[PDB]
Structure formats: structure tokens, C-alpha cells
From a paper:
Inside the cell, SO42− is activated by an ATP sulfurylase (ATPS) to generate adenosine 5′-phosphosulfate (APS). The structure of MtATPS was refined to 1.97 Å resolution and obtained in an apo state despite co-crystallization with APS and SO42−. The structure exhibits the typical ATPS fold comprising three domains (domain I, 1–156; domain II, 164–314 and domain III, 320–382). Similar to many thermophilic bacteria and archaea, the domain III contains a zinc-binding domain (320–343) that might contribute to thermal stability. MtATPS superposition with structural homologues shows a slight domain rearrangement probably due to the absence of substrate. All residues critical for the reaction are conserved in MtATPS, arguing for a conserved reaction mechanism.
Methanothermococcus thermolithotrophicus is the only known methanogen that grows on sulfate as its sole sulfur source, uniquely uniting methanogenesis and sulfate reduction. M. thermolithotrophicus activates SO42− by conventional ATPS and APSK, but transforms it further by uncanonical enzymes.
Numbering used by the authors:
A (entry chain A), B (entry chain A): 1 to 382
The structure:
């Protein structure tokens, strides 16, 4: 098969050097609106076509459509609302104006404001997140938004500084990379942790029916205790060098603030990976879900409502390392009792390292452990 | 699918207790013909339906058809000639007579002689074995046969004494066993050696797409150096107990003298396994072939000429244990050089044990080794 960008064509909303030049000369005659970091990232994903066919923030009819149907008005799958919020005090502009969107003191984007509209916060929250419980991070963030959403097209002037720009290839680059290597089918594997054997098992299992693997670590906010992103990248570089043939794998990052919308977000992740050029998308259990809100297989079941998605989700059956079979196996072929079975848990393996323990090599490749240990502190303190 | 016996129906040519009674009272009025042990085994396989639809030894038109087309006159696949040979001196009978076939001083079968015919030994040999080189065991055995072949139906009175009768279930028993366990698809795995990890890998790999596995050790002539058959059976019993879930495997023996006909014999083995009730038949490299006569994949390629065989051959791609991946892998997913790779060789593993060495556990399950070692001598001295 061939991977076509969501909506037919890859969006490019980067500003010409002529536009960025004049904007900053004439910036005092443009209303400024402050945005959060998550939004500045959304704006680079719009500009670089990661959110194709979006060309800016959603207008009213599109927002309502996304809430009610997870589709755009024209029926194209779209499941995560991409919106810009302002309060009454922050609203120093009107419909038709051109405004500048600032992150701190940096102008990130100019925006042609098409529509300024209101919304029901309780409907927003319940429909996106399937709950109106304030304990849910996303419901809490929805309830904190400004009263007004602002729809219209953007042009990217500046982007938030990225330490790993070298790894952050945009969709036009990953597509050309797939084509150079002769890959017609490509499987996306999304992660925010170092690779364990379970991860490798799935990726090499996909290698049997797909030409290549696109490992796509997400750069986002870090809880205290997570692996530093540098660590995830170096660990994966060690894995590929030592255990993968050379023309089977591509590693590039993408910046994206998780909304923890559960199954509604798995569709979004598939759309982003489609835009990168992928034909297939591995989906695991509890994907982008928050415990006690979404079922483990919920994020798999939702793809039944999107036959038209044109990227193939891949669901794998349960598996575990067996210490008597000495192999990754499954219940159908292994008769051994629970003490021989080791289920893979990125969290248990991380806590091991945090507690000063060595993961067995049926959990973690020796060389991957040595790479993690080569950092004086591989974990975020903030 | 459902497994139907070759030709539609399972042959039973066992003699009634009334026939065996009178035959031995009136034996002095029946010509006796001495047969080889291989032939007495052929006769039990005919009687118990292992050779369905055969009901005795082939007549002239059928023999010619099998040589030229590997099919019976009615076009049914049949590839190995099942014939009874006598010399001029041994021929104490005529067409229409009823004769007794003796192995030593034991009457094994009575036979209604339909046809006594001649044949060209050089054609026989070249067509069955693809060579007329006397160095080929089968060509040498063909050249030693009596000048006359004898066609006609048999009835089994006595069979060669079998130490493992308890394991030698006939096709009517294995079919009923499959049905009792609810297996609709069954895969045959044929062997004459103890199980190594490669064997287990294939059998459990088949378990993913088939309901059960039918491991079918062949009892036949033993070269000096082979494992005793008792050892193969106990080793497999240890393997299943320790590494297989309980309702996935069935182990029964069959007695059969290999003709070393290469690909022509792989079709015969599939027909025998079909008659046992199997739907699928694993075929490995150099199956029933003699080195420097048949290609490694020759025995796979021949099934292209038998679409109508109604038992599905299974061909597996190359694989090997990797001592850095620590797993059975393949070239597509493993980049490591030749010193990390261990290809499975039942012969190399046997020579290890003969030379007093311990096979690594990536070659042989600890418990399987301990079972073999539990015999004071696990190898045949003659
Ligand atoms: Zn096990
Ligand atoms: Zn390897």
C-alpha cells in the first residue's frame, strides 16, 4: 500500500522569510496573545503538517463536530480538539484581525482570526474525556481554559527551542526517508520510555509483515521520576546498533502534550503517524488513558468506528517471558505456573533502576542498561 | 477443515478369527512365500489402513502408473510402489491361488494372487529414485528383488512382534483420539530422533494455526549409532510433560521401512499421515532423501504437482538460535555474525552425546538430556 497524508495533502504553514521579517518590524501594530507551551507545540505540529489537514485552530462548527462525532464537518476523522482559548481580559482583538501568538517573549505564530466563540465547559470535558470528574487531568485543564475559543489559520514564525531538533524530523522528511530506503509499508511504535525486551519483540514481530519500523518517542512534560529524554534516545540508539539490522529502523521524535483522552487520543496518534508516512500503527493496552477512566482494550476497540482511517492498527495478543521455556511465549504454548512468568512492565523496570537494581537481561539488553547507567542521573528531578 | 482418508475410506484388511483359525488348520494346503521384514510391516500398514486405498500389493497397471505418474490408474496420488517380489524358484503358485506370506516361521498374511508379472529393474530404479546408481541404497535394493512381482489383495493374520505396540495406534484410533479432544486441524511431525529446541519451535509455531500436534516417530531399521527407539519415546514423553500444555500433543509410532526415494517419498509420508487423520504435514529439508541425489527443498517442491492431495504441507523459513539475541531468530531480524548463530542439527547434537558432551540448553531441554542419560546406553550397538 501507499501512505497518503490525512485529508490528501501535507499542510505547510511556515511563514516566508518576507513575512517573518515584516511581522517583527511591525509587531507593535498587532495584538499579542499569550499561549501555553502545549499550544506553541500544537502550532509547530500544524505548521509542519503533523496535524494535516488542519491549517490552524478549529472554528465553531468543526469543534462541535469533533466533540460529537470525532469527525470534521466534511466527515474526515478528527478526534482531538485543537483550539486557542482566551479570557475576556486577554481578548484584545476581534474577528478579522491578525494577531501574534507569544510564548513568553517569543512570537511563535501569526493568526488570521476567523471566529471568536463560546462553548460549554462541562460538555467539552465530558465528551472528550468521557467523564466530568475534576480529578481527571484533562477535565481539570478543560475547566481552566478561557471562556472564548478562537478559530482561524496560522503561520509559524518561531517555535519553542528544542534540544533534540536533530531528531525531530517533520513529516516531509520522514516520508522522503522511507522512500529512499524503499519501504512501502511502515509501522509506527510510539513510546516515552527506554526499550525493554517486550518492545523489541513487538517491533521485530511487525518486521515479518512490514518493511520498516518508525520508533517515535514523544517529547512532552516530564513527571519527576521519568527517564530523561536524552536517556530514551541514547538507549534506543544502543538497542538499534547492537540488535537490529541496519535498514529496518528509523528513530525520530515528535513534540506533543498528551491530553490523556484515552481512546479518543489513540485515533489522534494514528492520524499523526499517518501524516509522518506510516501505514501501520501498533496499539498497546491503556493507550493514552488515565487509570480508572478507560478500559485496557478501549483504545483498540475504537478503531472499529474508523474503517476509513487508511492507517492499519496492529493489536498483539498477550505474551510474557517464561523462565523455564527461556523464551518470550504465550499461554497457548506454555503450561508453566505463575512464578516462571514475567510480564513486561516499563514501570517496574524503571523502578528497578531507580531502586539501584539490575534488570535481568530477559527484561533489558545488557548494552541498553549500560547506556542508561552511563548517565550520572538518568531521571528528571523536576 | 475435515481430514478424509486417502481414497475416501479407511481400509481394514484384518482377518476374521474364523479365517485365522481355519488357515492355520489347513496351512499345509497353501503355498508359502517368504517375505522380508520390511514387507511384513508393509502388510500391517495395508491391513490397518495406513496405506488406504491399497488393499494389497499393486498389480501391473497400477505399478506402471505409480512409476510414471506417482498416481494410481484412477488418477489418485500414489507415489511409492508397494509390491511383493518372488524369484522363479520361490514362485510355487499361480494366478488365482491363495498363498500364505511368512516372515521366518510366522504366517503374516494370506493373499489372493490376481497377477504375476515382470518389470524392468533399471526403469523401476531410475523412475522411483531418479538415479540408476547402485551406490544409492534404494537402487541396490531394487536390483536385488525377484524377477516377478505379485499383485492382489491380502488379509493380515499375524504381524511382526512390536515392543512398542502400546504406542502404535492405528489410523482408526488416532482419528477417534483427535475427535475426542475436539481437534479439527492436526499437524503431523515425523521424526526418528530425540527432540531438540528447533523441533519444539516448529511444533509450537504450528500450534498458533492448528488445534493439535501429532508427533509420529517412525520405527525402522537402525544404523549403529542411532538413538534407541525407547530413548526417543521417553525423551518426547519428558518434553511434553515439562514443556507442553496437556491438550496440544499426541505421540504415536508407526512402523515403516524408508525407501530413501527423496521427494517421491515425502508424498507417501503425507498420504500416511492423512490416513491417520492429519490435515497438515510439516516438511523439512532433505526429507527422506539420500545425500548427493536430491536437493534440500526438492521434497517441498513436489507438492506443487499434487494440489488434490487434501493434506496441507507446511514449509518453514530458515531459523537459528542466536547467542546475543538469546533467542531463536531469523536473518531478517538478527544482524549478528556467524559465531553467535547456532543452526539446529539433530546429528551434531547426537554426536555430542556420543562424545560425552553436554548439549547447551539452547539445543536440548535439561530434562530431556537427563532422560537420555538415564539409559545406560541410549544408542544401538548393531
Ligand atoms: Zn513456559
Ligand atoms: Zn542475533
Amino acid at each position: 500500500m501507499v501512505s497518503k497524508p490525512h485529508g490528501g495533502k501535507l499542510v505547510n504553514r511556515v511563514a516566508t522569510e518576507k513575512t517573518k521579517e515584516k511581522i517583527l518590524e511591525e509587531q507593535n501594530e498587532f495584538s499579542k496573545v499569550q499561549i501555553r507551551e502545549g499550544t506553541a507545540i500544537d502550532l509547530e505540529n500544524i505548521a509542519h503538517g503533523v496535524y494535516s489537514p488542519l491549517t490552524g485552530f478549529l472554528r465553531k462548527d468543526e469543534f462541535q463536530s469533533v466533540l460529537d462525532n470525532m469527525r470534521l464537518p466534511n466527515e474526515l476523522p478528527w478526534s482531538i480538539p485543537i483550539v486557542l482559548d482566551v479570557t475576556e481580559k486577554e481578548k484584545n482583538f476581534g474577528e478579522g484581525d491578525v494577531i501574534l501568538l507569544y510564548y513568553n517573549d517569543t512570537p511563535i505564530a501569526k493568526m488570521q482570526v476567523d471566529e471568536i466563540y463560546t462553548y460549554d465547559k462541562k460538555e467539552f470535558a465530558k465528551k472528550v474525556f468521557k467523564t466530568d470528574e475534576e480529578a481527571h487531568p484533562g477535565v481539570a485543564k478543560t475547566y481552566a481554559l478561557g471562556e472564548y475559543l478562537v478559530g482561524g489559520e496560522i503561520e509559524l514564525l518561531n517555535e519553542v527551542p528544542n534540544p533534540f531538533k536533530s531528531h525531530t524530523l517533520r513529516p516531509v522528511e520522514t516520508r522522503a526517508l522511507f522512500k529512499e530506503k524503499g519501504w512501502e509499508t511502515i509501522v509506527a511504535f510510539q513510546t516515552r520510555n527506554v526499550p525493554h525486551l517486550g518492545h523489541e519483540y513487538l517491533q521485530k514481530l511487525a518486521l515479518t509483515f512490514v518493511d520498516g519500523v518508525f520508533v517515535n518517542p514523544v517529547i512532552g512534560k516530564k513527571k519527576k521520576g521519568d527517564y530523561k529524554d536524552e536517556v530514551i534516545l541514547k538507549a534506543y540508539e544502543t538497542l538499534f546498533e547492537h540488535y537490529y539490522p541496519k535498514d529496518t529502523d528509523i528513530l525520530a521524535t515528535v513534540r506533543y502534550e498528551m491530553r490523556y483522552a484515552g481512546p479518543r487520543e489513540a485515533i489522534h496518534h494514528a492520524i499523526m503517524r499517518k501524516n509522518f508516512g506510516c501505514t501501520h500503527f501498533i496499539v498497546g493496552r491503556d493507550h493514552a488513558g488515565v487509570g480508572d477512566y478507560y478500559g485496557p482494550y478501549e483504545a483498540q476497540e475504537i478503531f472499529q468506528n474508523f474503517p476509513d482511517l487508511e492507517i492499519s492498527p496492529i493489536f498483539f495478543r498477550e505474551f510474557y517471558y517464561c523462565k523455564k521455556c527461556n523464551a518470550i511465549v504465550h499461554d497457548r504454548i506454555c503450561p508453566h505456573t505463575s512464578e516462571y512468568r514475567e510480564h513486561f512492565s516499563g514501570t517496574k523496570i524503571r523502578n528497578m533502576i531507580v531502586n539501584g537494581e539490575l534488570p535481568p537481561e530477559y527484561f533489558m539488553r545488557k548494552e541498553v542498561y549500560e547506556t542508561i547507567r552511563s548517565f550520572e542521573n538518568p531521571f528528571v528531578d523536576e
